[PDB]
């Protein structure tokens, strides 16, 4: 039975280079020759304790493309949740007696991990947990990178924005640090720098990384430009405004980029990427968003199906 | 062992003796590891004259032996301690606190948004030494804190 | 065509001993040999005018296990519902022209009954109505009792907690008073006693019941220990605290219980049952929650299917 | 009370010895009353054998004396404990725990709505015995509870 | 100096028979001859952590009728929690440095008592601390009973409504219990009966009391009829309706009442006192609210002035 | 006429060394000999567009201690927007026709400044305009430093906490920078450091300052320890916890502090100053809040009176 069969998908760190490649290989196949009844008769719980429409819609669409049923809920906006009542341990203990798999998104770090200890034999997939993990978004970022660059080794990857609190850039850095020869360029405001811990891990591997203050400063040599959303709340509106101009991508900034270079963004973009970029062949965030479907179909197929016949 | 002073001294038949516990740590260990929850005769000695090392705490648990794993749990609180096995009134065995791999249910994740706090789960941290400083990574939120920070609680 | 075919499931009182047994027999079968396309092509409306996730998820999972489709809604949090507008009579008149069955949960007593008068030929199942009925929860409690005790006659059943306002203990008492020789033990705080009316009905049948102040007081002789949630709002926090200690189950209190004795709770437990009980073989609330699925699949199969072929 | 003249614990020259503490309460007493936050020699014996009650706890604090009030505070936990004041290897005087009129800091108000729960204030309860039990009245919320409930778990 | 000078008024249990007579003697003199400038130059903080428009308006009118200035605030919240942090202790430690007295209402029991521990030399006056005390409402009631009956001893007092929860009847019973020969008739449904701790104190002090089924049985004897509101939320709508009628007062019931008989009510009355009662000479609930002005001026005059030249 | 007569108090940058000494000399005299009727007949508007109970209560107590009347309002809102329309300009143009002075707090920077453009001859006093200024809190602090140290020059001042965002430390540093020989120790985590614009001004003016890792390194030298609250929201919960300990003050740290050393804090303190500090003679945060009463009376007395006979 496949390596991922019945496993829980909690943190990217629990996945080896071999696992990532297995998911990505399956995703490409599901994209080529679709299997609409593969999961027929399964019932999956879409448990969004934290609301997220883009992510819920994508996971659920994934569930539907494979023939599975979906039960679930979203935004548990309890008026001042001092105690929503039931413990999460209890909720999972109950839900795991109804369904065949649980996809959950929760506000607190470690929630999907805890769930794992009460779901019994039912696999639980992490759809986001606090400021910790969001593995499905990474599987989608890597699949989009491999699809467009043809490889996950020897790439010049730039990560721009809120490198400090962006849970996704943290994960992408760890996943790609599992492949060889990748060079990282970190473009972030002084107050939102890549955490030391990530730099530390990188150095151990003997991976190269450099810190840049401007994007055009490294424009010419990047294959992937991964922009993230700088949240103004993390900043003062004056200081925000003071640094803004330094990290917003406009089509002009791309005039020196390579033919193969693509711009990714977990979305939503808003200030950071001008619409004029949408029209260039380097824009790949919407295509990246579509690949979530195959990355997600793949993951579910592998976990819920003894052997993938493709 | 027996603090043979002048008049009298006590001794257990066979069991464990934890000696060289730094002062003020003795009671914590009894509390934390819930060692006082047995029907066994326990003898505790607090603020004992060590002279050289200073003042020490001492614990003797009768007809009770600690697995190497249990002895290892003392590392962060009393790494200097010596755990003696006594059988037939004498020290058949002697081991010391070795740095564990994981530290269960005795610590508290300083991450306030960690799921561990409000739930029916034992905490668990992964011990990682980085030359004397010990980083402890939470099993749940996966954050890594200094042992200093976690230990204050 | 089966006795329950096309009938409405409004109150437990409308079901005879023969009906209860028919549902329970069907549930056991659906649990053994599943029928995933039995309801294929039906569309069921999940109408939760009052939100309830555990119940909605369970009913919907039930709908999915039998191949049916589901349309519906939940928590109609109208800002101060002096008048939500349309009458319930009108809503059901409209919804009954789209679907094949309506499962509804409403805040006011008698809502499912009213619906019945406007759904035309469409069956309506009561998923909870005010402080009146909640028949599906009972069918699930009885199925769990029969499954674990092997019978619904001659049992020593204890009901603990808010016996006064607990709509479920009221229903379980009536259902079991349809079988013979059951002895009831009522453990409740003075301010939350079993309503006189229930005692009255019991006496007419010539059924035995005794009132106890402590659980361990009857521990040794019960087969079923049915705990309910004592809601603090119904009480003063001091008086709550004053009685609390008297009605919370800990594993210790079970040391004298019988091998066959099981602890049920409609859930959510919170204060009342300590987690240490979860680990004992007497804990059966989560298993009881799983049986809701078969009790619910059964009910829907019987109502929507001319004859059950099993 | 218990007299072993063979494997016996070493006696104290001067101090306080709390004897007859019922088993499993001795540790609570150390915790509750912060008896270990001292530099003096403390010797604790747990689950000690005494046919008089089977297993008892015992605590000896050196060069330390408990006042009448302080002793009275043990009244809820070890009501039959004997507090023998020691000097020069002889019991210079005993003491029995008397139920006091007020109890501070150690108890917690059962009342969930009591303000004493979220504030920088030391709990205080008025003690009044009434057949079968002892009632405790909170200084703050003024609600009266049975000791049995105040002393919950 | 007078006995109440610079003293905190926290609980009725803290004041004596004399203290009570002293407050009521002063109230009477101020009602007769007002002192519009006794507290001039004094600033008083009306701190309503729990909003209570009726109580605040009255307290503040009282402050203004003596010439004092008022700064304060009404309520503090969110939905089912609040905000971040700052202890009641620091709040009182700060405010204590600006004002000359603190009047305060709070949702938690013991809040006023705790304030006296941080207010220094500033007297703290309790306008209501959760289900615990409400000193000034009892003084206002007592002043009304004395004003209309001519005495506080040897009265026939009937209390009606929700005796289990009414913090005003518990307190009034305790205040009246400090005087002689009073007799109490308690008329409440079975679920809302006078708690046993009050009954015990009455017994202990040799005070006569008795339970009655309806106001009718005892109308002729009663001098004071004290009513309270039975909130429907303390009962299930069905339950409420059955008892209701037993504790609702109409002008027609006053039929055989003594000349001096007065009907009192803390207010809001809603269903309990029919409007046709307002026209009888027995209705005194509005005149009781007006007296709150003088019982309150009395306290402030006594606590802030070392001597009263009244 | 005095120099501050009929002047607006908007920013600390608008007042001079003299102006500061003039406000503090008056504050001292009013604290010594109160003038309860200096502002009688004057009506002042306490306009809190942004609620701040602590600041409002103090400002209004100040107005009342001088005999002025107060009309005003606290907060204005919706959830994340507000209402319809009416400029701050028209609001001030209207209110300016009723009252004699305007005290106002507002969420946007520059709001108080704009008011002076529409208030005519009515002086506008800033109680806080977003992250910009808060003049009266700095005057209250300065009055507290002077009152306890005997001077505003040649002091050793240590500032602790969130220096990046604290609008009170930026302002205090600017005020103290108008005096001579002061030395500043800035003790903050790396993410919340004193902005460079402040550091630049210090440099430009030849003023000595230095960064320190912990209060310990410099306790012995410091005359004034000014603390601020590091809001957990400015950090990720994990981040917070790691730094936290470095900037939390206990009574035990005060161990080697000078006799004259005072600990100040704008408040609310929460975790930053342990309660055991309140018992040392060094704790002066509560006495600092009380002085706000006199720095505020001082301003109003000076702005509304052409001459003070103090
Ligand atoms: Zn954690
Ligand atoms: Zn209390």
UniProtKB/Swiss-Prot annotation, chains A, C, E, F:
It comes from the Bacteria. Keywords: Pyrimidine biosynthesis, Transferase. It catalyses: carbamoyl phosphate + L-aspartate = N-carbamoyl-L-aspartate + phosphate + H(+). Carbamoyl phosphate binds at residues 54-55, 105, 134, 137, 267-268. One of its GO terms (biological process) is 'de novo' UMP biosynthetic process. SUPFAM superfamilies: Aspartate/ornithine carbamoyltransferase. GO terms for cellular component: aspartate carbamoyltransferase complex; cytoplasm; cytosol. It is an enzyme of class 2 (transferase). L-aspartate binds at residues 84, 167, 229. Pathway: Pyrimidine metabolism; UMP biosynthesis via de novo pathway; (S)-dihydroorotate from bicarbonate: step 2/3. One of its GO terms (molecular function) is amino acid binding. Gene3D superfamilies: Aspartate/ornithine carbamoyltransferase. Its EC number is 2.1.3.2. Belongs to the aspartate/ornithine carbamoyltransferase superfamily. ATCase family. Catalyzes the condensation of carbamoyl phosphate and aspartate to form carbamoyl aspartate and inorganic phosphate, the committed step in the de novo pyrimidine nucleotide biosynthesis pathway. Heterododecamer (2C3:3R2) of six catalytic PyrB chains organized as two trimers (C3), and six regulatory PyrI chains organized as three dimers (R2). NCBIfam families: asp_carb_tr, PRK00856.1. This is Aspartate carbamoyltransferase catalytic subunit. The lineage of its organism: Bacteria, Pseudomonadati, Pseudomonadota, Gammaproteobacteria, Enterobacterales.
Swiss-Prot record, chains B, D:
GO terms for cellular component: aspartate carbamoyltransferase complex; cytoplasm. Keywords: Metal-binding, Pyrimidine biosynthesis, Zinc. One of its GO terms (molecular function) is zinc ion binding. SUPFAM superfamilies: Aspartate carbamoyltransferase, Regulatory-chain, C-terminal domain, Aspartate carbamoyltransferase, Regulatory-chain, N-terminal domain. Pfam families: PyrI (PF01948), PyrI_C (PF02748). InterPro entries: Asp_carbamoyltransf_reg_N, Asp_carbamoylTrfase_reg, Asp_carbamoyltrfase_reg_C, Asp_carbatrfase_reg_C_sf, Asp_carbatrfase_reg_N_sf. Heterododecamer (2C3:3R2) of six catalytic PyrB chains organized as two trimers (C3), and six regulatory PyrI chains organized as three dimers (R2). NCBIfam families: ATCase_reg (TIGR00240). This is Aspartate carbamoyltransferase regulatory chain. It comes from Escherichia coli (strain K12).
């Amino acid at each position: 039975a496949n390596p991922l069969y019945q496993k829980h998908i909690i943190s990217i760190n629990d996945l080896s280079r071999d696992d990532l490649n297995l998911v990505l290989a399956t995703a490409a196949k599901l994209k080529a020759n679709p299997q609409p009844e593969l999961l027929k008769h399964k019932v999956i719980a879409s448990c969004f304790f934290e609301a997220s429409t883009r992510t819920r819609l994508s996971f659920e669409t994934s569930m539907h493309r494979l023939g599975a049923s979906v039960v679930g809920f979203s935004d548990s906006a309890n008026t001042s949740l001092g105690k929503k009542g039931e413990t999460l341990a209890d909720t999972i203990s109950v839900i795991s007696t109804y369904v065949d798999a649980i996809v959950m998104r929760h506000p607190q770090e470690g929630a999907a991990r805890l769930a794992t200890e009460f779901s019994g034999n039912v696999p639980v997939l992490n759809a986001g947990d606090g400021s910790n993990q969001h593995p499905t978004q990474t599987l989608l970022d890597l699949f989009t990178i491999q699809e467009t660059q043809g490889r996950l080794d020897n790439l010049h990857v730039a990560m721009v924005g809120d490198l400090k609190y962006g849970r996704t850039v943290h994960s992408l850095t760890q996943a790609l640090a599992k492949f060889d020869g990748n060079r990282f360029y970190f473009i972030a405001p002084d107050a939102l720098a890549m955490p030391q811990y990530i730099l530390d891990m990188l150095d151990e591997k003997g991976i190269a990384w450099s810190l840049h203050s401007s994007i055009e400063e490294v424009m010419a040599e990047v294959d992937i430009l991964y922009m993230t959303r700088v949240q103004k709340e993390r900043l003062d509106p004056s200081e925000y405004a003071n640094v803004k101009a330094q990290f917003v991508l406009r089509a002009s900034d791309l005039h020196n980029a390579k033919a193969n270079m693509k711009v990714l963004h977990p979305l939503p973009r808003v200030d950071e990427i001008a619409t004029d970029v949408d029209k260039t062949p380097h824009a790949w965030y919407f295509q990246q968003a579509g690949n979530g479907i195959f990355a997600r179909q793949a993951l579910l197929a592998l976990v819920l199906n003894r052997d993938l016949v493709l | 062992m027996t603090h043979d002073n002048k008049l009298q001294v006590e001794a257990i038949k066979r069991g464990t003796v934890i000696d060289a516990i730094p002062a003020q740590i003795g009671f914590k260990l009894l509390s934390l590891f819930k060692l006082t929850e047995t029907d066994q005769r326990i003898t505790i000695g607090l603020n004992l004259p060590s002279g050289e090392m200073g003042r020490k705490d001492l614990i003797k648990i009768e007809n009770t032996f600690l697995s190497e794993d249990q002895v290892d749990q003392l590392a962060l609180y009393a790494p200097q301690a010596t755990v003696n096995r006594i059988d037939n009134y004498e020290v058949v065995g002697k081991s010391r606190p070795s740095l564990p791999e994981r530290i269960d249910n005795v610590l508290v994740c300083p991450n306030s948004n960690c799921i561990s706090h409000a739930e029916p789960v034992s905490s668990s941290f992964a011990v990682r030494k980085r030359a004397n400083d010990i980083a402890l990574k939470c099993k749940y939120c996966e954050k890594e804190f200094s042992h200093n920070v976690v230990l204050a609680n």
